[PDB]
Amino acid sequence: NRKSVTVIGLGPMGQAMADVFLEYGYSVTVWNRTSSKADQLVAKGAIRVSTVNEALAANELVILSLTDYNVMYSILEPVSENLFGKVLVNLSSDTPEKARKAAKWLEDRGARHITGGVQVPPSGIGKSESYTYYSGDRVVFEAHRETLEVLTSSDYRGEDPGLAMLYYQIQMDIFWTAMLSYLHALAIANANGITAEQFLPYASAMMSSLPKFVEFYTPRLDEGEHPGDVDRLAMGLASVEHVVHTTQEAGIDIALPATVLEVFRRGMKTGHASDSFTSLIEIFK
Amino acid sequence: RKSVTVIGLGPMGQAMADVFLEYGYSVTVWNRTSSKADQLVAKGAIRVSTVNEALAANELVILSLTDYNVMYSILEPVSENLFGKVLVNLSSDTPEKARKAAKWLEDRGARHITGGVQVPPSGIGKSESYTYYSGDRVVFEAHRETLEVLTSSDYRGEDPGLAMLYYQIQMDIFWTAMLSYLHALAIANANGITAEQFLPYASAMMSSLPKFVEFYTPRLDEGEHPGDVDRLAMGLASVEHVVHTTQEAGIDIALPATVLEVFRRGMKTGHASDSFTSLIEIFKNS
Ligand SMILES: [Mg+2]
C-alpha cells in the first residue's frame, strides 16, 4: 500500500472518494475536465494538477469517476503513450460491453483495468456497510483491494471486466422500472382521492413481498421450466387488462401498463396461455 | 352462526359456501348451471331453482360472479325484489364499475359492499388471508362478522370504488416490477449468469424499494420535487445505460424503452433539475 492515488472526476462522487482518501493519510492528486477549484479538498491537502498528463504521471493507481466510457477515450486517447504501467479503476457507470472493450484498449497500451459499480450515493463512501461490485483481473484486484476498501466494502464478481457493470445495470433495470410503476400506481390513487400517505403501507407491502416470488420461481427459471401448476398466463393477462382499464378510467397515461399488456399478449400469441407467466422471459430473450 | 346466500358457484363461490357450511351456517345457493351445486348440496347447502328464491332466502347475498355484467344480467329482470338486500360484489374490475353497481342497487332499495379478495380459493377460511372492503360503513359493520368467517377484513372507506382501487394499484406494481425482474434476468442469462446467482441481488434491490417509497411519500403529498438528493437528468442518463445494456445483450427493448420515453417526456417539459418524482406529472397529464 503506497498510500498515493490519483482521482480523475470531481463531481460529488469523485470528491467524496478524494475526501476519504485524504482522511486516511493518502497523497491525493486530483484533476477534472472543467478545472473545478476543489477548494475544500485542497484545504485538506489534495494536489490539484492542470492537465490529465500530470494526473496520470502522479501515480500508478488512478481512480476514474466520469460520466461514461466515451469520456475516458476522449481524455486518454491523446495521451495513449503515457499509460504504460498504470492501473485504472473505472468507477463510471456504463454497459458491460463498453467495460470489456475499454479493458482491452488499455491492455493494448500497457495499462491494467478494474471495473467498479458503486451501489451507494456519495454519502455512503467511507462506510463499510456500503458495497461496490468489482471485476477484472484477479491479481490486479487483489493488489489494490486494500485501497479500494477504504472507500467501501468490495464484491468481487469475477475476471470478466464486464461483470461489475452487468450486476450494476440489471439491478438498475429493476430499480427504475419498479419505481416508475409506483409513481404510475400513485397517480391512479391520487385521481381517485387518496394520498401517498394512504397508499404507503400497501405499496410497501407489495414491494416487500416480491422477493418471495423471486425465490419461488428461481429454480424453475434455471431449469427453463414454465409449467402452469400455480399460475397461468391467461389469468395474468386478464389481471393486467383490469389494471389498464383502471388506468384509463383515472385519466392516467397508459404507456407503461400498455407495454406490460403487449408483452403478455405476445406470450399468448406464441402459445403460452396455460404456462406460468414466467414464460414471458422467452419473449424478452 | 346463522344464514347466507351465495350466488355464483365457480371455485371461489364453492370455497366460500364450503367454509360457511363448516362453520354452521345455513347456506342457500344458485347458479345458472344447476349441477355445479351437487357437492355442496350433499354437504347440506340448500339449492334453489331461481334467482328470486335465492334473493328471498336471506338479507346477505354474496355475489361470486365472473364479471359485473353477470350481476346486471341476472338481477335487472328481478329489480323489484331487491329492497332490503345487501349484495357483496366480489368481481375484479375497475373502481368505476363498482361505483356504478352500487348506485344501480341503491336506486332499487338494496345496499352494496365491494370486496377485493387477495387470496385464491385455498385461502378462504384462513385468518392470514385478507379481503379489501368498501361501501357504507354501517352496512359493512352489520355484516362484518359473517364476512370474517371467510377471511380477515380490511375496510378502506365509504366509496364503493376503494376496494377495487387498492387491489388494482397493487397489481400495477406487481406485474410491472415482476416483468422487470424477468427482463433483468434475461440480460443476466445472455452474459452467462443464472437466476441462482442473481437471486440475492434481485432480492436485495426489491427489499430496498420501500425505503425509497417512505422517503418520497411526504414530498409527493406536498407536490414537491426538489433535486436535493436526485436530479431527473441523471436518472435519464442511468436509464439510457440500461437501454444500451439491453440492446447489446440482444434482449427485447420494449419495457426499458417505455421507461426511457417517460423520462424523456419529463425532460422535455422542463424538469432537468427536479427529482425523478416529478414524472408523476407525466403520468397525471396524458
Ligand atoms: Mg471530468
Q: What is the Å distance from ligand 1's center to A81 Cα? A: 20
Closest residue by Cα to residue B131 from B101, B166, B178, B98: B166
A83 and A102 in contact (C-beta within 8 Å)?
no
Closest residue by Cα to residue A89 from A142, A168, A144: A144
Q: What is the DSSP letter of B47?
A: E
Tell me the chain B residues in contact with residue A67 when contact means C-beta distances shorter than 8 Å.
237
Which chain B residue has the Cα nearest residue A191? Answer: B284
Q: Which residue has the cell 439491453?
A: B246
Tell me the chain B residues in contact with residue A206 when contact means C-beta distances shorter than 8 Å.
170, 173-174
Long-range contacts formed by A200-206: CB under 8 A, 24+ apart: A200/B213, A200/B214, A200/B217, A202/B166, A202/B169, A202/B170, A203/B169, A203/B170, A203/B173, A203/B210, A203/B213, A204/B210, A204/B213, A204/B214, A205/B170, A206/B170, A206/B173, A206/B174
A84 and A146 in contact (C-beta within 8 Å)?
no
Q: What is the Å distance from ligand 1's center to A129 Cα? A: 27
State the nearest Cα–Cα gap between B3 and chain A, in angstroms. Answer: 32
A100 and A70 in contact (C-beta within 8 Å)?
no
- In sequence order, the β-bridge partners of residue A136 are A114
Whether B198 sits inside 8 A of A170 (CB atoms) is yes
Which residues, including other chains, have CB under 8 Å from residue A101's CB and lie 6 or more apart?
A: A69
Whether B251 sits inside 8 A of A221 (CB atoms) is no
Q: Which bin fits B115, alpha (ψ -120 to 50), beta or left (φ > 0)?
A: beta
CA quadruple B247, B249, B250, B253: dihedral sign: negative
Which residue type sits at B175?
W
Kind of pairing, strands A112-118 and A131-136? antiparallel
Cα A209 to Cα A197, A198, B130, B207, B280, distances in angstroms: 19, 19, 15, 8, 24
Question: From the CB of residue B35, how many other CB atoms can be counted at a distance below 10 Å?
Answer: 10
Q: What is the Å distance from ligand 1's center to A10 Cα? A: 6
Q: Residues A29, A32, A35, A38: what is their CA dihedral angle, to the nearest 10 degrees?
A: -50
Which residues, including other chains, have CB under 8 Å from residue B23's CB and lie 6 or more apart?
A: B1, B149
- The DSSP code sequence of A55-119 is HHHH-SEEEE--S-HHHHHHHHGGGGGG-TT-EEEE-----HHHHHHHHHHHHHTT-EEEEEEE-
Domains of chain A: 1-158 (3.40.50.720), 159-285 (1.10.1040.10)
Element (H, E) at A8: strand A4-8
Burial call B246-282: b when 16+ CB within 10 Å, e when fewer:
bebbebbeebbbbbbebbebbbeeebeebbbbbbbbb
Instruction: Please tell me the experimental approach by which this structure was elucidated.
Output: X-ray
Element (H, E) at A54: helix A52-58
Cα separation, B227 vs B231, whole angstroms: 5
Whether B261 sits inside 8 A of A252 (CB atoms) is no
Q: What is the Å distance from ligand 1's center to A71 Cα? A: 8
Q: What is the DSSP letter of B4?
A: E
Cα separation, B92 vs B65, whole angstroms: 9
The 3-state secondary structure of A121-180, one letter per residue? CHHHCCCCCCEEEEEECHHHHHHHHHHHHHHCEEEECCCCCCHHHHHHHHHHHHHHHHHH
C-alpha cell at A132: 461496490
Whether A197 sits inside 8 A of B217 (CB atoms) is yes
B89 SS3 class: strand
Cα separation, A136 vs A144, whole angstroms: 12
State the nearest Cα–Cα gap between A203 and chain B, in angstroms. Answer: 6
Q: Which bin fits A93, alpha (ψ -120 to 50), beta or left (φ > 0)?
A: beta
DSSP H helical ranges for chain B: 11-22, 38-42, 51-57, 68-75, 95-107, 137-150, 162-190, 195-222, 232-248, 254-267, 280-284
B214 and A240 in contact (C-beta within 8 Å)?
no
Backbone angles phi, psi at A229, to 5 degrees: -80, -30
Whether A192 sits inside 8 A of B162 (CB atoms) is yes
Whether A253 sits inside 8 A of B280 (CB atoms) is no
Which residue type sits at A15?
Q
Element (H, E) at A201: helix A196-223
CA quadruple A80, A85, A91, A94: dihedral sign: positive
C-alpha cell at A160: 470478466
B90 and B63 in contact (C-beta within 8 Å)?
yes
Please name the member of A172, A190, A280 whose beta carbon is closest to the beta carbon of B179.
A280
C-alpha gyration radius of chain B:
24
Which residues, including other chains, have CB under 8 Å from residue A141's CB and lie 6 or more apart?
A: A114, A134, A156
Q: What angle do CA B217, B222, B225 make, to 5 degrees?
A: 75
Structure's resolution in angstroms: 1.7
Whether A253 sits inside 8 A of B92 (CB atoms) is no
Q: Within 13 Å of residue A37, how many CA atoms lie on the same side as its CB?
A: 3
Q: Which bin fits A271, alpha (ψ -120 to 50), beta or left (φ > 0)?
A: left
The greatest distance separating any two alpha carbons of chain A, rounded to the nearest whole angstrom, comes to: 67
Cα separation, A166 vs A163, whole angstroms: 5
A50 SS3 class: coil
B3 SS3 class: strand
A116 and A91 in contact (C-beta within 8 Å)?
yes
Backbone angles phi, psi at B174, to 5 degrees: -50, -60
- Cα(first)–Cα(last) distance of chain A, in Å? 45
Whether A219 sits inside 8 A of B196 (CB atoms) is yes
Please name the member of B187, B203, B221 whose beta carbon is closest to the beta carbon of A211.
B203
Q: What is the Å distance from ligand 1's center to A101 Cα? A: 20
Closest residue by Cα to residue A263 from B248, B257, B244, B254: B254
Question: From the CB of residue B52, how many other CB atoms can be counted at a distance below 10 Å?
Answer: 13
Tell me the chain B residues in contact with residue A217 when contact means C-beta distances shorter than 8 Å.
195
Q: A131, A186, A222, A229: which to substitute to probe chain B, counting the most B Cβ within 10 Å?
A: A186
Which chain B residue has the Cα nearest residue A212? Answer: B203
Q: Within 13 Å of residue A88, how many CA atoms lie on the same side as its CB?
A: 31
DSSP H helical ranges for A9-51: 12-23, 39-43
B130 SS3 class: strand
Please name the member of B170, B242, B246 whose beta carbon is closest to the beta carbon of A176.
B242
Cα separation, A144 vs A134, whole angstroms: 12
Closest residue by Cα to residue A2 from A34, A24, A19: A24
